[PDB]
Amino acid sequence: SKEYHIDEEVGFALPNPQENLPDFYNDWMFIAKHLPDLIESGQLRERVEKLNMLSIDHLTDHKSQRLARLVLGCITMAYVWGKGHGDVRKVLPRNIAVPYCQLSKKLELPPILVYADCVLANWKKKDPNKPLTYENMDVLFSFRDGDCSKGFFLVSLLVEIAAASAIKVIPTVFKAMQMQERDTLLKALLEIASCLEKALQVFHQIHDHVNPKAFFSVLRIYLSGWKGNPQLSDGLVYEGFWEDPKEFAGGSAGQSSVFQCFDVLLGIQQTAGGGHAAQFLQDMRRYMPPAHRNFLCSLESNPSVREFVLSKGDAGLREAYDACVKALVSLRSYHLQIVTKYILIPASQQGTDLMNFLKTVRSTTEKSLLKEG
Amino acid sequence: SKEYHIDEEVGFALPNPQENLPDFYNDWMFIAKHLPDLIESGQLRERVEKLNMLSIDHLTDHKSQRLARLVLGCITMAYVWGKGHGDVRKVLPRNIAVPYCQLSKKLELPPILVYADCVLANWKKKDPNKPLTYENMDVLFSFRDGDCSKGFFLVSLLVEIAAASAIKVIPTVFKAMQMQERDTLLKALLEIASCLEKALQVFHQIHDHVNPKAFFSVLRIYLSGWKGNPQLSDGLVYEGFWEDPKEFAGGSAGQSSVFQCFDVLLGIQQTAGGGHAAQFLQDMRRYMPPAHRNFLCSLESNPSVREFVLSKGDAGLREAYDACVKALVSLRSYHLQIVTKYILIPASQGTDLMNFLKTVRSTTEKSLLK
Ligand code: HEM
Ligand code: HEM
Ligand SMILES: Nc1ccc(Br)cc1-c1nnc[nH]1
Ligand SMILES: Nc1ccc(Br)cc1-c1nnc[nH]1
Ligand SMILES: Nc1ccc(Br)cc1-c1nnc[nH]1
Numbered sequence: 001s002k003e004y005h006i007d008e009e010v011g012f013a014l015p016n017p018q019e020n021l022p023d024f025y026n027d028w029m030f031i032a033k034h035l036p037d038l039i040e041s042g043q044l045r046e047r048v049e050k051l052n053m054l055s056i057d058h059l060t061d062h063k064s065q066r067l068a069r070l071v072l073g074c075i076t077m078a079y080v081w082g083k084g085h086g087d088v089r090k091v092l093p094r095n096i097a098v099p100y101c102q103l104s105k106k107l108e109l110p111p112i113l114v115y116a117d118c119v120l121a122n123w124k125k126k127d128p129n130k131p132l133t134y135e136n137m138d139v140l141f142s143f144r145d146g147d148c149s150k151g152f153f154l155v156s157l158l159v160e161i162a163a164a165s166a167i168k169v170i171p172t173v174f175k176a177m178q179m180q181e182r183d184t185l186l187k188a189l190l191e192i193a194s195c196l197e198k199a200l201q202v203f204h205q206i207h208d209h210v211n212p213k214a215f216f217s218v219l220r221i222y223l224s225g226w227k228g229n230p231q232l233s234d235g236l237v238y239e240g241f242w243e244d245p246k247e248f249a250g251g252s253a254g255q256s257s258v259f260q261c262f263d264v265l266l267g268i269q270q271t272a273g274g275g276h277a278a279q280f281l282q283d284m285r286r287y288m289p290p291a292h293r294n295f296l297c298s299l300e301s302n303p304s305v306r307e308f309v310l311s312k313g314d315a316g317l318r319e320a321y322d323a324c325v326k327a328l329v330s331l332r333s334y335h336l337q338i339v340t341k342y343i344l345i346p347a348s349q350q351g352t353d354l355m356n357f358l359k360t361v362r363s364t365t366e367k368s369l370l371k372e373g
Numbered sequence: 374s375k376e377y378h379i380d381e382e383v384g385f386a387l388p389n390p391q392e393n394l395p396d397f398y399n400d401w402m403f404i405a406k407h408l409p410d411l412i413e414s415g416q417l418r419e420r421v422e423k424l425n426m427l428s429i430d431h432l433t434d435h436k437s438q439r440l441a442r443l444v445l446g447c448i449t450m451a452y453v454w455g456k457g458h459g460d461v462r463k464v465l466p467r468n469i470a471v472p473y474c475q476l477s478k479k480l481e482l483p484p485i486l487v488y489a490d491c492v493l494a495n496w497k498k499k500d501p502n503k504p505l506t507y508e509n510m511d512v513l514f515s516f517r518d519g520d521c522s523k524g525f526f527l528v529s530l531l532v533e534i535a536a537a538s539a540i541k542v543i544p545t546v547f548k549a550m551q552m553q554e555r556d557t558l559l560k561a562l563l564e565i566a567s568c569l570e571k572a573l574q575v576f577h578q579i580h581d582h583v584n585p586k587a588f589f590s591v592l593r594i595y596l597s598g599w600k601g602n603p604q605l606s607d608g609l610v611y612e613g614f615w616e617d618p619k620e621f622a623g624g625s626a627g628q629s630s631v632f633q634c635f636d637v638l639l640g641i642q643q644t645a646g647g648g649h650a651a652q653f654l655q656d657m658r659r660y661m662p663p664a665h666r667n668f669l670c671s672l673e674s675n676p677s678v679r680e681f682v683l684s685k686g687d688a689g690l691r692e693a694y695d696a697c698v699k700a701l702v703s704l705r706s707y708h709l710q711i712v713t714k715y716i717l718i719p720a721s722q723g724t725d726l727m728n729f730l731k732t733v734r735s736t737t738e739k740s741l742l743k
């Protein structure tokens with residue numbers, strides 16, 4: 001494919017992301033690398049206010065400024081949300097908010113933590129020679145001890161990598177339709193569903209690394225944004241960069257392109273319409289790296305594969321297409337099981353629009369099947 | 374630019390749009406050509422209700438499926454707004470509701486009259502071998518007598534054709550960036566800024582052929598949509614297509630590709646920053662013909678012209694890039710002077726509106742280099 005920066009083996013996730021910033025930023029990196037201890041002792045908001053306003057101009061390449069965008073993004077959630085039970089600050093200091101919005105504007109991303117930061121750029125191979133397994137991988141930053149941020153971010157990364165192996169098949173699919181090669185288009189679709197089926201099995205690992213109350217009561221808070229949230233009703237002022245407070249949404253997996261790019265490929269129109277589900281997933285495209293949100297829109301530029309499969313009265317071709325589609329339903333169905341475990345049940349041991357959103361994304365996917373009515 | 378359906382002479386507008394449908398669709402074109410008298414006669418809404426459910430199967434080519442969408446688009450606005458004084462139908466008759474909505478589904482458009490309908494496809498040459506200027510041109514459809522829809526639809530279209538002259542230069546700009554031909558890139562930038570300066574001058578003709586009396590009270594009413602509008606709080610029931618009422622946004626020039634396409638070429642990211650202006654302009658892209666939101670998406674897929682000019686420290690390149698940005702700034706600021714004459718003082722005889730345009734104009738200003 002063209003340079004949408006889709007690595008061959010890890011896909012959309014940043015390949016071998018950078019761990020250490022230049023020594024010029026050693027005072028950023030200390031607060032980020034010690035987020036749990038600084039928060040629970042009560043010194044974080046202090047220690048960020050005692051920083052100097054460092055300059056982006058020492059952030060050379062892409063990998064360095066993503067890492068800096070991750071460091072600054074995690075520090076921001078640490079500042080805004082505090083210890084995570086209510087004492088909130090709605091003003092981000094200038095020494096932190098200026099370099100953030102400058103770096104973020106250079107990367108065409110909003111100034112808030114996003115899936116591309118805490119997942120796609122927040123990982124590390126422990127042994128550079130063993131494969132991308134959970135036990136060979138680690139996270140770069142956490143918010144609190146026992147927040148399961150290692151499990152949550154790494155499992156998502158492993159799921160994204162699993163679905164990424166289907167991305168290299170997409171070029172075959174489009175050429176097979178163009179040159180009208182039915183047998184290759186069949187197995188091409190068959191293998192895309194194969195990778196999406198492998199993605200579902202890696203997703204099962206989340207039970208082994210994420211605890212329901214930790215996620216709910218801890219990790220959920222530090223991933224919250226300030227769009228539509230009462231606690232910051234008008235958003236967050238970025239002192240020294242913007243005059244009025246701005247409103248940006250929290251990090252979500254709807255910000256990932258692989259999870260969006262298969263509805264687009266299979267003609268499943270999650271973004272079509274004016275409904276809340278459609279507009280939300282359209283909104284989250286703006287929280288993706290620019291190269292990624294361009295990859296989605298250039299898939300929409302191609303001819304519909306859903307129609308090509310409809311147009312041909314081919315049973316083996318419609319079942320192959322349906323295999324892709326079902327895999328998405330199976331992923332989204334098992335996913336509802338998991339938001340029930342990790343959000344719904346803990347929410348009652350101390351809401352519905354969340355469910356209806358997911359069941360609508362799910363419904364749209366099931367309705368896209370051609371067979372099994 | 375292979376088949377984003379850009380015309381060499383006309384640009385994103387439909388080149389020489391078709392005037393008459395098949396005679397199978399004479400029942401449609403009758404209401405469409407006779408909207409002014411049928412609306413004032415109060416007989417419009419019935420003649421829509423007492424028409425058969427025609428099939429879209431006999432609209433063969435793009436040019437026929439377009440003006441069919443133009444015909445059904447105007448009939449729908451008239452049926453929903455009526456005489457234009459507040460009394461609103463909230464249900465679309467199913468014998469018009471679904472020929473419209475499957476023709477819209479075929480062209481990937483939303484079922485409502487939009488900029489590509491009433492401007493890009495709604496024109497004609499008076500004398501075929503005379504130039505594309507206002508006197509030699511006319512619009513194919515109007516709403517009410519004296520609504521100045523001819524002026525408002527033509528001066529917009531003529532502005533769109535002036536900017537089309539710069540579309541020819543876009544491949545030269547990117548080919549220059551890759552081959553690294555800094556001399557050819559500069560004149561390419563200057564030729565672009567040149568046409569955006571002739572687009573502002575063509576825009577001056579607006580004060581001639583449209584009238585603040587008629588635009589605010591008549592034309593703006595018939596071009597209004599049912600999205601975030603209290604008159605159709607929940608939208609329009611497209612009877613026989615969706616049980617629920619769907620809500621679509623009205624017509625806007627933000628639905629035009631040329632004016633979004635220069636922002637993206639120059640790295641002016643209106644659509645970025647999470648602002649209200651960012652989302653309106655992006656949501657307007659789904660009200661565009663599919664090749665035009667395709668062409669726009671693939672411009673963003675190229676390396677930004679803005680950063681190449683910043684890399685070089687080339688005062689000449691920097692001045693050329695500014696020349697286009699300033700052409701955009703003055704287009705938007707002179708455009709702010711027109712909403713003042715045509716929307717605000719008329720409404721004095723609303724302000725979230727100009728907040729959008731000033732934010733949009735200021736981000737155009739903040740993009741200047743020195
Ligand atoms: C504790 C585990 C999880 C919980 C509680 C959870 C919860 C949620 C919630 C609340 C939403 C609604 C969208 C939003 O609020 O932004 C959502 C959607 C979504 N989730 Fe998760 N999630 C979890 C794990 C995962 C993982 C590991 C993935 C990796 C693929 C994932 C993929 C998605 C996607 C793609 C969406 C967007 C809707 C769609 O495209 O189907 N989720 N989830
Ligand atoms: C009486 C004349 C006009 C009035 C009152 C008017 C009004 C407006 C309004 C209210 C908006 C805000 C967006 C919206 O509410 O839809 C807007 C934006 C816009 N106008 Fe017009 N307009 C006029 C003529 C024109 C013409 C002839 C053009 C030529 C194409 C044009 C180009 C644009 C564009 C492209 C936008 C989108 C915002 C931008 O990109 O700058 N306007 N105008
Ligand atoms: N899997 C994830 C990884 C990182 C971030 Br931020 C959010 C999610 C998510 N999962 N469901 C909804 N969002
Ligand atoms: N909800 C989704 C939508 C598209 C894709 Br691809 C994956 C998921 C998913 N959810 N949990 C794990 N994976
Ligand atoms: N110039 C236009 C022509 C047709 C339609 Br519909 C809308 C406009 C417009 N201008 N400013 C905002 N919208």
Ligand SMILES: Nc1ccc(Br)cc1-c1nnc[nH]1
Nearest residue numbers: 532576631632635704705708
């Ligand atoms: N508002 C605009 C935005 C972009 C471009 Br290009 C032209 C205009 C304009 N149209 N009439 C007056 N100005």
